[PDB]
Design a protein around this ligand. Structure first.
Ligand SMILES: Cc1cc2nc3c(=O)[nH]c(=O)nc-3n(C[C@H](O)[C@@H](O)[C@@H](O)COP(=O)(O)OP(=O)(O)OC[C@H]3O[C@@H](n4cnc5c(N)ncnc54)[C@H](O)[C@@H]3O)c2cc1C
Ligand code: HEM
Ligand code: HEM
Ligand code: HEM
Ligand code: HEM
Ligand SMILES: O=C(O)/C=C/C(=O)O
Ligand code: NA
Length: 568
């Protein structure tokens, strides 16, 4: 067979997969995926038949209920979504190589000729608020709005939910929480505010950072009441005390939070539409929002009439062409992001009259695995790992800022360095087991042997670890001044992870005020238009701190949803 439908129709009728009239049920292909499940079982049941020792196409870290048509199309060959970050050995039937080629918003001007017909028709739906983007900010705002009494529609252009939020690991920053108090930490919303401004080089909009620190415990309490586990509190760079919240034992904060928000949206019956891209905010004759034109992958262009639109589309760190224009030093780098984090949400905000700010500030994460091509959390350093170069020595404060850590790593022999840790660090952060499972953390029972495997000077590494361990025991790093030294590297075996920088987060974006209202260049509010999460600029200034983006999306998403509901 040349394609999946053709293979099944050898022994089955069209209506084994299609509705009685033959029309696609909707852009999520809800009915059609229920039929695949009907015969093959759920994703978990299919996963029992495709087991590999350390990976499985049908059992991954993605949260929510991943549709089969996310990877299996029927009438044409299709792509494995995992290939957008990994290169596992797969043999999916009727596959084609991963290639993302999505027209820009500007390029969709070519469809003028179908857009006008859509716009001339009656609205397909009439609701109170449309939320664009199913990352942390967008689910947070959809739930908030709905909880406040508004009818919402939540769209996602991708076939799967979660954006980049689902990939987060290190934590959700908050201060003065009950979770901190249980671990015996002393903190406050004023120290979180202070750490943040200093980390953002004082470019941050102070009124936005105040909302960030003052709503942070609240956001943590909100998530926990919805079912989240945020009781592990670790340390991340540039924080004066531990404040990075995550699930028990140090699992990834990201996939967990997005799974909780999806489960909660599903319980409120929120209208969630996959493969549906927001294209153009529609305004009436006095410039206030009246709706949005969307492009459904399977059903074409239609418009939704609504009083408010909340853009929660994330950043543009996957778009290296746009990144390179703004920061030529990052051209050619690999990204840590999902394939659709390209900035089209910014283009929608601009066409509507919204202004942008801080666009030149782009953050590179210092430690991508050279071997796996994926981020390795800064929490591995926060829980005690050191960085060593090929000569077997320390060369930087490992919990310094992302900008300084990336430059120091790049300055080393080979433009990369190695994370080095033991079983005491490994056991303190369960996320480390995921790196071991990926195959990217070689191990040996002595540093001499470990350096010999990885090409690190073995006897100098042995001396380096002995010297760091005596600094830990003393309480002060006089070589690099790392201010937190939580454990000696001396229990069980040793591990090394080869690491190097990659493009990660865009701190600039659309201009919002403290109610998350989008403004134009004259600082005038555009009525009915909201912005929340990494699509906005002004929260993180010139350098975001680890853990502060998950705090930002929950807080600002929640608030945009409440204000849109009230505006109405
Ligand atoms: C690998 C990784 C790990 C991270 N770890 C952490 C952490 O531990 N702590 C932390 O503080 N930060 C962390 N960050 C940053 C953090 O995850 C975020 O900045 C991201 O979660 C922001 O969430 P968001 O909701 O604003 O956007 P996203 O979660 O990216 O979601 C936005 C969504 O909008 C959808 N969309 C975009 N444009 C449109 C359009 N036109 N039409 C329809 N849908 C649209 C996108 O496809 C996407 O799904 C991490 C980021 C990455 C990549
Ligand atoms: C779009 C929906 C579906 C998806 C994604 C899907 C997935 C697949 C795939 C990947 C294969 C292997 C093809 C090959 O080996 O070349 C397959 C085969 C098969 N499918 Fe489907 N399927 C779908 C719908 C259905 C439905 C509705 C039925 C039953 C009426 C069905 C029953 C089968 C059977 C019987 C086989 C052959 C092997 C077996 O005995 O399980 N599938 N399917
Ligand atoms: C001869 C039998 C079939 C006919 C005439 C038929 C008809 C169609 C048509 C006309 C479309 C596009 C409609 C639109 O764009 O609005 C479509 C798409 C689709 N069909 Fe079929 N279909 C058949 C068999 C199947 C089978 C066997 C499956 C699953 C195994 C299936 C699953 C789908 C899905 C999932 C889509 C969405 C697009 C895609 O994945 O290709 N159909 N079908
Ligand atoms: C419940 C939903 C799904 C169904 C029913 C389905 C169906 C199937 C079937 C019947 C096979 C053939 C393997 C076998 O059992 O011999 C298969 C293989 C495969 N599917 Fe799916 N699939 C689903 C979802 C997905 C998703 C969401 C992805 C990607 C994220 C995906 C990617 C693959 C890959 C890569 C293979 C080949 C596996 C390997 O070489 O290990 N599938 N699928
Ligand atoms: C259904 C699709 C995917 C599958 C089956 C898959 C599979 C895996 C596997 C086997 C690992 C090793 C640890 C573990 O067992 O969980 C892993 C880790 C990882 N993957 Fe994926 N992957 C998928 C898609 C993606 C995509 C598209 C991205 C980036 C957007 C990504 C980012 C990562 C990261 C950052 C890690 C490191 C450990 C962590 O943060 O948990 N994965 N993945
Ligand atoms: O887990 C990490 O390394 C990333 C955290 C962040 O970007 O806030
Ligand atoms: Na931003």
């Amino acid at each position: 067979a040349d394609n999946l439908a053709e293979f099944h129709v050898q022994n089955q009728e069209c209506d084994s997969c299609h509705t009685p009239d033959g029309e696609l049920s909707n852009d999520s292909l809800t009915y059609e995926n229920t039929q695949c499940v009907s015969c093959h079982g759920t994703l978990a049941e299919v996963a029992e038949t495709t087991k590999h020792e350390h990976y499985n196409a049908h059992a991954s870290h993605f949260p929510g209920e991943v549709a089969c048509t996310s990877c299996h199309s029927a009438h044409e060959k299709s792509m494995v979504y995992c290939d957008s970050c990994h290169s596992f050995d797969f043999n999916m039937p009727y596959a084609k190589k991963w290639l993302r080629d999505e027209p820009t918003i500007a390029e969709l001007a070519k469809d003028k000729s179908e857009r006008q017909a859509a716009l001339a028709s009656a609205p397909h739906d009439t609701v109170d608020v449309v939320v664009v983007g199913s990352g942390g900010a967008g689910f947070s705002a959809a739930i908030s709005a709905t909880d406040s009494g508004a009818k919402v529609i939540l769209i996602e252009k991708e076939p799967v939910i979660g954006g980049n939020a689902k990939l987060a690991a290190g934590g959700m920053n908050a201060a003065w929480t009950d979770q901190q108090k249980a671990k015996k930490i002393t903190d406050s919303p004023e120290l979180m505010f202070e750490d943040t401004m200093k980390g953002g080089q004082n470019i941050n909009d102070p009124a936005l950072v105040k909302v960030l620190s003052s709503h942070s415990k609240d956001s943590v309490d909100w998530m926990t009441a919805m079912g989240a586990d945020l009781t592990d509190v670790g340390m991340m760079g540039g924080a004066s005390v531990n404040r990075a919240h995550r699930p028990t034992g140090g699992a990834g904060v990201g996939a967990h939070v997005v799974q909780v928000l999806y489960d909660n949206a599903v319980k409120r019956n929120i209208d969630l539409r996959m493969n549906t891209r927001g294209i153009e905010v529609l305004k009436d004759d006095k410039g206030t929002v009246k709706g949005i034109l969307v492009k459904g992958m399977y059903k074409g262009y239609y418009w939704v009439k609504a009083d408010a639109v909340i853009l929660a589309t994330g950043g543009f760190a996957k778009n290296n062409e746009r990144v390179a224009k703004l920061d030529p030093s990052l051209k050619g780098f690999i990204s840590t992001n999902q394939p659709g984090a390209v900035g089209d949400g910014l283009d929608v905000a601009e066409n509507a009259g919204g202004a942008l700010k801080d666009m030149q500030y782009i953050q590179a994460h210092p430690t991508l695995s050279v071997k796996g091509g994926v981020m390795v959390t800064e929490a591995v350093r926060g829980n005690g790992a050191i960085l060593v170069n090929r000569e077997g020595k320390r060369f930087v404060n490992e919990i310094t800022t992302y900008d300084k850590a990336s430059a120091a790593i790049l300055a080393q022999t080979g433009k990369s360095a190695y994370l080095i840790f033991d079983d005491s660090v490994r056991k303190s952060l369960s996320k480390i087991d995921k790196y071991i499972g990926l195959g990217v953390a070689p191990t040996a029972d002595s540093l001499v042997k470990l350096g010999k495997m990885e090409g690190i000077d073995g006897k100098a590494l042995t001396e380096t670890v002995a010297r760091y361990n005596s600094l830990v025991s003393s309480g002060k790093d006089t070589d690099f001044e790392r201010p937190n030294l939580p454990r000696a590297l001396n229990e069980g075996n040793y591990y090394a992870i080869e690491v190097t920088p990659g493009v990660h987060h865009t701190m600039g974006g659309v201009m919002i005020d403290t109610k998350a209202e989008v403004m134009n260049a004259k600082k005038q509010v555009i009525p009915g238009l909201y912005g929340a999460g990494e699509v906005t600029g002004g929260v993180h200034g010139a350098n975001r701190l680890g853990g502060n983006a998950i705090s930002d999306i929950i807080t600002f998403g929640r608030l945009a949803g409440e204000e849109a509901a009230k505006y109405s």
